[PDB]
Design a binder for these strands. Sequence first.
DNA 1: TAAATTCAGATTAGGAAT
DNA 2: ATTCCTAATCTGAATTTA
Length: 352
Amino acid sequence: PIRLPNPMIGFGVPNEPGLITHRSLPELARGPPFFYYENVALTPKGVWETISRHLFEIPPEFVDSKYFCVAARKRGYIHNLPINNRFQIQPPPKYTIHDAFPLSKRWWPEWDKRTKLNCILTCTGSAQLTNRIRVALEPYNEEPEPPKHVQRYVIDQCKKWNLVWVGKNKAAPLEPDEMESILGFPKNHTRGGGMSRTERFKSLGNSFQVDTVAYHLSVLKPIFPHGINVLSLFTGIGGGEVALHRLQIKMKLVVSVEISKVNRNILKDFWEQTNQTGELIEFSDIQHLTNDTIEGLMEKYGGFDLVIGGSPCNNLAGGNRVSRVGLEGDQSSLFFEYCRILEVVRARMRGS
DNA sequence: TAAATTCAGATTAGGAAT
DNA sequence: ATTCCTAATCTGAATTTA
Ligand SMILES: Nc1ncnc2c1ncn2[C@@H]1O[C@H](CSCC[C@H](N)C(=O)O)[C@@H](O)[C@H]1O
């Protein structure tokens, strides 16, 4: 059984001890192509064992993004990239809550000892929650400090819903612009393109932490001086593309497969607003992307140097009450579609 | 009718005491 | 091997707004 590492630093995170400069990966796992898989770390029993079983028995690298930004984010990363001489994109996001939220020290209570936020999710705290916290602390405004049972209801609910102090006895969740900044995207990366505020929360909560992924993909820069052809599966708002761009790694071609029309609009907007000289090809449903289509694309552009993607965590996340049924769930089973497309690439890149 | 609102527990792990 | 707590957690869907 996979035992999650404590601390969850993977092979090493910046400013922390325990950096592992070399690993030995099995023969069946070697590139080309380099590939990068991502999913949540806190899955039902025996999910990552199955994920590793279908990805050449590579032990997953579990890294909590609280070492890269202000919000925690526990994910597993299966990849065949070299782990030596990584680097972070500069400047790194704000580490603590005091720095990430300058105006919060005006309203933050002394008994809220949080210096770090929990995971950014797709479901945000409601306004009726902020009121129940406001009413709970109201009868103690003239007192220097509310009693203990009043404190830990507020404390536990702030941790439960990732609330920051925005007003007098007012604990509200994060705004989309704050989630963008914490997850490592530029400001207004998901604002336009027909994306409603409701949709912004969902696709942001589903996305990468760009600094964590960029720290991992950083080793690709000396290997490909002339750019890479990228096969992006489950693109979303383009976490991997933003990471590659911040690494100054030219993207000659990005074939993106993302079923959300608003997410594809976000990516195309990001493509033009950055003046990317390369070509962006956009596919929608991965279940209709045939193996011969991949072979035809690889023949035109000359194979993919990197296959990056993160399969749905619908049926793996602890927040899911309805359908947390594991890897065989309706959405998370698309992980085997990732293995299908990846296997086609390997057939041409390495053989057999 | 797109957008916004609201609330709906369980499954893990780990620590610590039997 | 049990019992008992703290603790985190890329969510679904019914319903109402507008
Ligand atoms: N059948 C399907 N075909 C292609 N993409 C799909 C799909 N079903 C779900 N997806 C997409 O897979 C994505 C997984 S969330 C991952 C998003 C990405 N890692 C990022 O950085 O933003 C979701 O955005 C979802 O839109």
